[model samples]
Target: DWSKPLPPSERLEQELFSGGNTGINFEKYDDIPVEATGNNCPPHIESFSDVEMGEIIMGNIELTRYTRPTPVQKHAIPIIKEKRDLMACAQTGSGKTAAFLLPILSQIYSDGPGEALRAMKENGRYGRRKQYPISLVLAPTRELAVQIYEEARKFSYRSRVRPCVVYGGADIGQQIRDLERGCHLLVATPGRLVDMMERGKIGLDFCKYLVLDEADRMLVMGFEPQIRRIVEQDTMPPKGVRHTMMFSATFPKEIQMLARDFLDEYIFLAVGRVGSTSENITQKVVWVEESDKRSFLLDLLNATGKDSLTLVFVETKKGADSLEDFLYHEGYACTSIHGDRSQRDREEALHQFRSGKSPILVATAVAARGLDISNVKHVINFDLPSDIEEYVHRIGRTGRVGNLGLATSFFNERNINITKDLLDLLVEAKQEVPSWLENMAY
Candidate 1:
């Protein structure tokens, strides 16, 4: 009877903890309880009662309507406001951006115009007096940098603080020009920032706050050396002299060690599980022969019957192109986003997907990180990720902004090692595990 299919299970609604699949296996580790004590929460003001976060900066911005803060925000905001270094981990969508950005922005505003005038005065060597930036936010990808910049602007709305975005693949000349005017905050990708820094266009000596958004991705993308070089070469304050904050869904051991060099006596806070499957998203595993994946996906699309928005994730750029071609020739309106595509082409593809001109998007892992698209009804993992952290990132495309969504993954002979972890994640979230998958082994 256990092997036989029954009625679909009812949806389980709950906030899942962080640790990826390991958190799901907590029951098995009863003898070894993970300590949850310490400043697990990042510091923030205890009372939003009389103190409105948005109104402090002279902005007509409203925080009263923004609902209560999430756990990460509640904990991290206080410490960051106190201007201490932090190394915190939390789920991707749990308001981590604001947790870091708010405190930094508040401090910038608190520093007053006198600090800005002093910074400008100190930059006289650059010929122009107004050629220094106060804060730097580094991200791995252009899109993510853009996203963070947008959020920073929103938080700083009507405030004296201004945020500027600079990334590669777009008008470097314009970025140089913007830097000359001076910015209170600069969000940039590593390569472009280094280029600007080398040209003596941007100075970091006056930067009191340094944020590495998506720190894991930055390290994985091989930007560690460039980041280190930029930090070391820049005129930054001493280790504890400048406040440093790193935000990422997963904090690998290696990255944690690398981060230690930048931070001094920092607090390590883990919010939600890294790569933890979302409770709002239901995951289904479909086993098919390698050659049959395409047809099976087509069949599943037809079965949905809603012209639902779906994102198909593949392992390689070639696979993304092939899948897009196959879907296009099959009369499906789909586009692909990968590294091989030109910047314009990639932007157009993303635009098309957002505009609903194309409901299906075939993407590589690059597209999966920090893409804040809305209403993605389903995410199809055409191939499982090698690392479980990546699997969380891929499925995260769907079930965003508090929407219920679906995720379907194709598991074949090649991806057997992930089955145990995948199954454990589903079972922990109370999702049904297909019996056939439970029978397979690596």
Candidate 2:
């Protein structure tokens, strides 16, 4: 029966002998683990007591709940409170969401009700309409937008402030109505917000604060043109009038240049890498004949037993679908997520995986970024990503929140080009590299 588990001996045999060896030698090396050392958090922050900033502490109680401030908060809050443009390079999960949100809320609160509304209406020419939002936070994906919106709502709960989220794959009419009701903060994806702007549903003239979360992804996804168009609406004051902040995990040179156009006299803050390598992750590289990869992956699954949940990451949607089918026929509970799937299907599949209804998930690069799944014990790279940066993000899904996890990569000639740089990263992270890969020139 499909539900029946394979016998232990049979599983072992399949894993050890079913796949033909690629004749690559394995050599283990001992290297000191690279600690994620650096000043991720600043040691001191200037006192806010003498500052004439608006009262945002009431909203802070809901989200922050701490007397002490985080590193990003200490440095960013004071400057942002002063209404200065910022460009921060903090690590992910560094409480950056609140760092930007609080100051923006404070500015909105200090502005009083009718003042921003009046400014918005008067700033526009040609009978353009006005909107209530003084701030907008742009995220790269719907999930990230929703996450930020939820946090913002919690922070503004008891206060008279309202925050709303707008993204694709949901009702547009609802978003339009929400905008009409006058939100103080709007968290959105680029495409949907641009759509709303083109339809005249959202007005930016009153907007005094802007944040671009995950700035790297925004540039990579080709949202620059749309972002430029949205910013060109002439609603907000020039660079100095709008307190703009951009946050990213890693800043590529191109993205930095792009950021310069939007921010004026910005401060750059960087947090060292976090959650890159985990002791819980038992990483391994399996070298097999190119033709034997499929059989070998099946063997590994059988050996690991069907009880453990596994996440398989490939390079393409077509590859994800093919692996999903193969695993299904092997009598395993399997599902897949890729860009090709409808947003609804993608969300549903993610729900299923998280709920343990489908323990094994096959996915593509779509799953690599900003996915906060808990207790993912294993991540198998069915295909290595071409960019070394993506590899770090992929493996980071496991060993998250201080949990130990496992990651396995399948290596062959076809993937050699991609895996070469990844090997260097592993070496830097203090992971053991097999000797065979050291001499591989091709």
Candidate 3:
């Protein structure tokens, strides 16, 4: 059968009845500033019902327990509904997924399954070698892609829309099988997606919506050329023809130039402090010597409740491995993930961390960008990043959506370059800055 599978009864039950996602403090979103720059940018919506989101999607929203629209959702959804290209700058946990998905799916669900899937099923073209998704979401990391795919499944449930995810370090044959079945909303990492395209397993001829989640990170990680090729490919629709939305937690001027290249007549939306740390997060800077940092982290871990989730970000894979082992040997449940690990191992570590099996996760920059782990009580920068933007993303793992959270950074001379930027960020967020750091900056 080329039909989409129904969600499990238990999954449905949990989503409908359970107290769903109270993480975002909705009242805090009310005062947040929003900027939409374009020629007569579309008016932002006040409520979910404001945009003809359809009965099924509205039901899904209720099931998801979203009482009100987040600022990003309020603004971005309208622009997307107008089918205008967008470059939005919002924090990681501000419901960017729904902001993009709701409008796109509203249109897709109402329009019915695309002509190709219907024709193939009727002709018994069950072995259709290639799949053409109507909406394409490109995430920088495998975990983020899978997370988006899961959200897509929830929103597209009971509809004809089919969502699939493709990433590296997984079995290509299995992914091919999933694609051959059908996919209307496809979430994929750049490498695996390019591979799929070259292997004739997927195409973009019917793609109407393109979402680049964490657009800055993808470009910074050197996916610019691949993204350029994919977007400019003969099969892919030209810039103005295909709707494009680029979402990022931070928008450097350099990256904005690159984004402008891919989008045509796009709205530049900045909600709240662009690239600044969330006020919900309490920031602390500790001047620890290189040799004493390990012991300080252990002390901090002991001080915090053991069961709460804590993410420790390091500068290198070796640092992640060493920290994980140290924490483990100290009789704490710990796991680590980095670029060098196999995809299976990385997913397992994340699963462990999320389920509280391992309350502490040591990771490198790979996990920094866009993996949302709600209820992360604390984020520790054991090895501070040189770029202040990276620091913002690292600490963003906690205080997600508006829940009060803590970020502690161990700073020494090694990170001297970022001192001024870090000090400015603290001041902007109304966080208390240490006199030592202020004097050092001066």
Candidate 4:
């Protein structure tokens, strides 16, 4: 049943949903910026035109508007299918999640439902109370994990595959309940995943797929200990035995070293410069005082219509709540998220933002890393974070996939530490950095 070729109508349906991803001659964008280091040049399926996937999954690709493979996706996907470990450096919203998930989903679906049962016996997890998924995706932030789960579910829809997500902010018991149902793909954050593993509720013995989405961010946020315990000192199979893939915007020297040890003959891929957002996004910075920043934001929102979706970012928990309250009283429907908010509140806020019920979202870096909302017309850095990496993720909330995006920031005396590098970054982005900003920091 699994080896049979897809029917003609089904193939045509795939082409339609694939946004005409076939026959992508890479001659024009010859400078799409990709790198690889391996003896075997992996099977070169540069675009979905050559992909032999199921009809249902193809429909999901259409649903995601995943027409053409992103620069990173074109190079990353086929290598993974060949049982090769991969390290992909890509900007947020560059289709990194789908790149890994697609290959994983395709392999599992081709194996048929009984393939999972056979693997359970092969890995000695058969008849055990604990369940281990065939593929495990480890990410830095809770939101990133949830986003990955959501995207995977869209592809796994109506299939034998069951994708589950567990993060720190949500209920552990509820997550356990979800796992008990059996999962083919499991997405999780480091802390929650470790806690679940130690409790004897989850096992990694049958894990054939392991992905570290935003691997560098996991280290920046200090998830190394938990990540090491999960990958290094656990029942999870060693590097060569299981396929491993790491995706991140930035590749720190330390994290790269750690990742190299975790992977076997991996391909290092960089879609663009590390720590860079999509050039598809237009970034702008304005000089403003801390006291007058809110007023300036009001003016900007005032200019745009209610249909506009804007994500406003602040520095702290108190600031997110304060901004949320101020925006609410100012007659703008808005929602806020931070550490202080309960797991339920965070999810509710995200739902409202995503559904366009509340088009304005005031958030901290908690919402920064990986939360995919399509219509975020603008990202407002109401208060910039401490580091440029956080800023990169914050603005990444907008300008998804290949969509054109705008990022407006309120820069003032408060952000001197970030000024020099930020200035050079904007200049490199071909944006006109404000002379005042250039003069103030220097």
lDDT of each: 0.68, 0.66, 0.79, 0.75
Best by lDDT: 3
- Give the per-residue lDDT of model 1 (tens digit) for 1-442: 1112223212311111111131122232223211122444343444444243433532312321344445666667776776667777664556677678876776666665345555655665655433456788999788778878876766665455668989866788887887766587899988788888788777777787889987766764456678888787667777878888887655554466666798776776665454334546788888888899998999988876566788888998788888899999999888777665555455555777887788888878765332344568988889898876567656766775356889899989898888787877677767888898778743
Clashing pairs in 4: none
Local accuracy of candidate 2 as per-residue lDDT tens digits, 1-442: 1112223344533443334332211111111111211233223254444344444444344233444445666677766776667777654456688778866766656655446455554664434243446688988788789878866765554455678889876788888887776577889888788888878778787677889998765654446667777776546567887779898765654456767889877766655553224434667776877578788888887786645678888887777887789889878888766565556456566787887788888877674332334457788888877776566656656764455677888887776786677666667566778778777844
Candidate 4 local lDDT, residue 95:
66
TM-score for every candidate vs. truth?
0.67, 0.69, 0.68, 0.65
Q: On a 0 to 100 scale, what is the lDDT of residue 252 in model 2?
A: 51
Q: Mark the 10 consecutive residues where model 1 has the least summed lDDT.
A: 12-21
Judge candidate 4 at residue 373 and give its lDDT. Answer: 44
Candidate 2 — number of clashing residue pairs? 5
Predictions ranked by TM-score, top down?
A: 2, 3, 1, 4
RMSD values for the candidates in order, in angstroms, are 13.4, 15.4, 6.3, 7.2
lDDT of 4 by residue, 1-442 (tens): 4333334355534543444333433344446677776768585565686766666666667665656777777777788877799888866556678889988787777766355556555785655388777899998777678878877876776566788999876678998988998777999888788999988988888798899988766764456778899999999889888899988765645556777789898887876675444567788899889889889999999876757789887888787887789989999888765565554555565777787788888777665333334568788889887877567656766675556778999988788899877887787667888888778766
Report the lDDT tens digits of candidate 3 across residue range 158-218.
6778789988767988998888777899999887789899999888998989999987667
Which of the predicted structures, 3 or 4, would earn the higher TM-score when compared with the native? Answer: 3
